């Protein structure tokens, strides 16, 4: 049965690719030659955030657009006040190998996880003054590689078990399981309407998952190496992904297509963290080569060089109001840029 | 910051920074050490010797007023490619090899080759621990499994002149031990660049002075790292 099944699956993927090619008629770059490029943007280090002992592996922005939480493997989740550079919280962890953090949209909770195999959710607004462990979600065989809140009582995680889990904070057990990835998933990003999310694994293929029904809605391929970073386009029907092959690229949900690849010859180290601006015109992408490039999402050109980090850039994210972008690197220093 | 609310927020941030300075003093005086191996290698008995689906089995042991951290990865899959760069600033990586199996020895050798040549794991020295030397000695003296059944190069092998055995021991056991050590040494010296070094050791589960060996190897590693940093090596 295996012999016929493999050939029929290969034929099915061939016909899927044939339909993909049929739907592909004119590329976005040649459509966007007519419109005027943004040109060159001078983004400067508006703020530098200091206090992390070891390198920073994750960061997230609040819906309030002011506070941001950053995780370091020295066992600290530092919640800052971005404008005043002040530290709002310094949460000590029970396992100092955190690579994930998710500031809740309501701001009440903060997630973390990593090699500890457990996603720790911490509450911030309590009768007593301290940030205690709200819950400890266990059930991932592999290391937690990304985590993102939906609301105060739900969170979606992507772990090293090549699987994602839709959790429930109240009960403490998994609600839905997302499987189908060969390699271990390293990052997921949520849609603005919070109905579907894109997760990128090391099988050089991202997947669009529906949170409610819990099945793999749409598989996207086209990368040569491990996918490290994922961000979802603000429109709600596209998303950018960044791999170790120093090339990031944009995919569209409805089109089911590999759009332009923001690749350049001088850059050879892969992308680690990727994000969009508020309008989606700009695409920021940190690199293993000390750099955080900014691409015009419709021109595929490096619209400005945004160096300033003395080590690997491992974190990124654009404030929900679009005012500024925070970049966390391995120099143990956050940097807020505008 | 002129407002009293902002002044008190800045003062709270200063208190948090003081706590972070205390944590920095604690963390900077502690040496981080990765522990790698395989099934039945002997990592578990080693980590219990100095003393669910959990991922990091943190261990802390103190030698000569120096704190060392064992980071054992458990209940995790193979293909240790994407979590291995987290241990980028660790003092060293202790690699545990069961030298008695002779059938998983090739897999352990390949794992050591992968770890030594890892692009992220450069600048990081490897402390090699060969375990179950009593079991290896019993197996080699019993003659149940010859070395040539798995390793054909044992025939054309000579014990090095600088190979000191235990005071009372069969020299075939010593030859096998030093051949197994020289395999990992050859892997380490094939492409080492003189920036990270391997420290093979012969030890058993009941050998209680494994923390002292880790201490000495880490002392040598940090000393050589500082000598290279100061251009003295």
């Amino acid at each position: 049965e295996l012999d016929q099944l493999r050939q029929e699956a290969e034929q099915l993927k061939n016909q899927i690719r044939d339909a993909r090619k049929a739907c592909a008629d004119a590329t976005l770059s040649q459509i966007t030659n007519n419109i005027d490029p943004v040109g060159r943007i001078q983004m400067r280090t508006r703020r530098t955030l200091r206090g992390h002992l070891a390198k920073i592996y994750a960061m997230h922005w609040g819906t309030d657009s002011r506070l941001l939480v950053s995780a370091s493997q020295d066992g600290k989740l530092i919640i800052w006040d971005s404008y005043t550079t002040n530290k709002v919280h310094a949460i000590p962890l029970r396992s100092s190998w955190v690579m994930t953090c998710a500031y809740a949209p309501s701001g009440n909770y903060v997630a973390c996880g990593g090699l500890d195999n457990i996603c720790s959710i911490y509450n911030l607004k309590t009768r007593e003054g301290n940030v205690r462990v709200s819950r400890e979600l266990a059930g991932h065989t592999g290391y937690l590689s990304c985590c993102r809140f939906l609301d105060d009582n739900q969170i979606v995680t992507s772990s090293g078990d090549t699987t994602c889990a839709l959790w429930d904070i109240e009960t403490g057990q998994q609600t839905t399981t997302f499987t189908g990835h060969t390699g271990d998933v390293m990052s997921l990003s949520l849609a603005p309407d919070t109905r579907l999310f894109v997760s990128g694994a090391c099988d050089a293929s991202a997947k669009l998952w529906d949170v409610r029904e819990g099945m793999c809605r749409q598989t996207f391929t086209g990368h040569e190496s491990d996918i490290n970073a994922i961000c979802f386009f603000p429109n709600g029907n596209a998303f950018a992904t960044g791999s170790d092959d120093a090339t990031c690229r944009l995919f569209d949900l409805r089109a089911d297509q590999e759009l332009m690849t923001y690749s350049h010859d001088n850059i050879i180290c892969g992308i680690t963290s990727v994000s969009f601006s508020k309008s989606g015109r700009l695409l920021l992408a940190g690199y293993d080569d000390f750099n955080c490039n900014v691409w015009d999402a419709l021109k595929a050109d490096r619209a400005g060089v945004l160096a300033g980090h003395d080590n690997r850039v491992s974190c990124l994210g654009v404030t929900d109001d679009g005012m500024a972008v925070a970049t966390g690197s391995w120099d143990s220093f956050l940097k807020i840029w505008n | 910051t002129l407002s009293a609310e902002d002044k008190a927020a800045v003062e709270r941030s200063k208190m948090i920074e003081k706590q972070l300075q205390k944590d920095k003093q604690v963390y900077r005086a502690t040496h981080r050490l990765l522990l790698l191996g395989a099934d039945n290698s002997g990592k578990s008995t080693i980590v219990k010797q100095m003393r669910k689906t959990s991922g990091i089995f943190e261990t802390k042991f103190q030698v000569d007023k120096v704190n060392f951290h064992m980071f054992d990865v458990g209940a995790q899959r193979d293909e240790r490619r994407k979590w291995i760069q987290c241990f980028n600033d660790v003092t060293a990586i202790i690699f545990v090899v069961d030298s008695s199996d002779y059938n998983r020895l090739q897999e352990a050798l390949n794992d050591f080759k992968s770890i030594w040549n890892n692009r992220w794991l450069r600048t990081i020295s490897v402390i090699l621990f060969l375990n179950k030397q009593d079991l290896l000695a019993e197996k080699v003296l019993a003659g149940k499994s010859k070395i040539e059944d798995y390793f054909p190069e044992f025939a054309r092998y000579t014990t090095p002149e600088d190979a000191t055995p235990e005071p009372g021991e069969d020299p075939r056991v010593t030859r096998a031990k030093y051949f197994i050590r020289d395999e990992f040494l050859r892997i380490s010296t094939a492409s080492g660049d003189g920036r990270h070094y391997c420290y093979p050791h012969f030890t058993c589960s009941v050998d209680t002075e494994n923390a002292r060996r880790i201490f000495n190897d880490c002392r040598d590693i940090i000393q050589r790292m500082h000598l290279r940093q100061y251009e003295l090596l």
């Epitope: 309030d64 002011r66 506070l67 006040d81 005043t84 002040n86 709002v88 919280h89 701001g107 009768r127 007593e128 003054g129 301290n130 | 002129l2 407002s3 009293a4 609310e5 902002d6 002044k7 008190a8 927020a9 003062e11 709270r12 200063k14 208190m15 003081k18």
Partner: single-chain antibody
């Protein structure tokens, strides 16, 4: 979360006494604490403040060196050393917890209060327009507060606090900065002010709204209170 105070009693004028407030159920090492006091026939008044780590400590105009404040983090208590007790120093003192990070709610929970009976400009003079008004339940209730200086800061925060203590029990916290509503208080309360005059509205009134409503400024730091509008049913 219980703020139990101990002490009180009849004290001869000019004497010295230590008023204590024991804190349980919450770690206030990150809390700045206020010793707000209630005169027998007047409104609330603030005398002193000790920070979380005691780095910044401020007193009031009427009591600068005559009072002394201490906190014992291991013992989890506040100590108030008061000296030269005049006829004015009669009040049911309240120990007040207030964490001072962004988005916090200072003055949220207050101590039980112990009565103290004895025998025989830069200050923001902010006054409430009225002092007593009987209003029927259900329909909207408007309470007016006015300040002698603009309370809006350059950072976009206009500090304001409303308490509405129920008769014969410790004041609670209704609204802070007239834009954010506390967890314990129901959502029916609201506030609005330009920066000099402020108003508080209640959607529906019940037996819990009986009492006198208070008004605090925090831009400058005399911590001057309002006269207080007494709501009687």
């Amino acid at each position: 979360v219980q703020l139990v105070e101990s002490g009180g009693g009849l004290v001869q004028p000019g004497g010295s006494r230590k008023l204590s407030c024991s804190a349980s159920g919450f770690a206030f090492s990150s809390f700045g604490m206020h010793w707000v006091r209630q005169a027998p026939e007047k409104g609330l008044e603030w005398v002193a403040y000790i920070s979380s780590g005691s780095g910044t400590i401020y007193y009031a105009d009427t009591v600068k060196g005559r009072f002394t404040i201490s906190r014992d983090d291991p013992k989890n208590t506040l100590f108030l050393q008061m000296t030269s007790l005049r006829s004015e120093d009669t009040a049911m003192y309240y120990c007040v917890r207030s964490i001072y990070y962004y988005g916090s709610s200072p003055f949220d929970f207050w101590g039980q209060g112990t009565t103290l009976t004895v025998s025989s400009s830069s200050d923001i003079v902010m006054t409430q327009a009225t002092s007593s008004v009987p209003v029927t339940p259900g329909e909207s209730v408007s309470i007016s507060c006015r300040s002698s200086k603009s309370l809006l800061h350059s950072n976009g925060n206009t500090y304001l606090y409303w308490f509405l203590q129920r008769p014969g029990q410790s004041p609670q916290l209704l609204i802070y900065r007239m834009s954010n509503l506390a967890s314990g208080v129901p959502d029916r309360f609201s506030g609005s002010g330009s920066g000099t005059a402020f108003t508080l509205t209640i959607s529906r009134l019940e037996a819990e709204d009986v009492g006198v409503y208070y008004c605090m400024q925090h831009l400058e730091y005399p911590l001057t209170f309002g006269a207080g509008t007494k709501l009687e049913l």
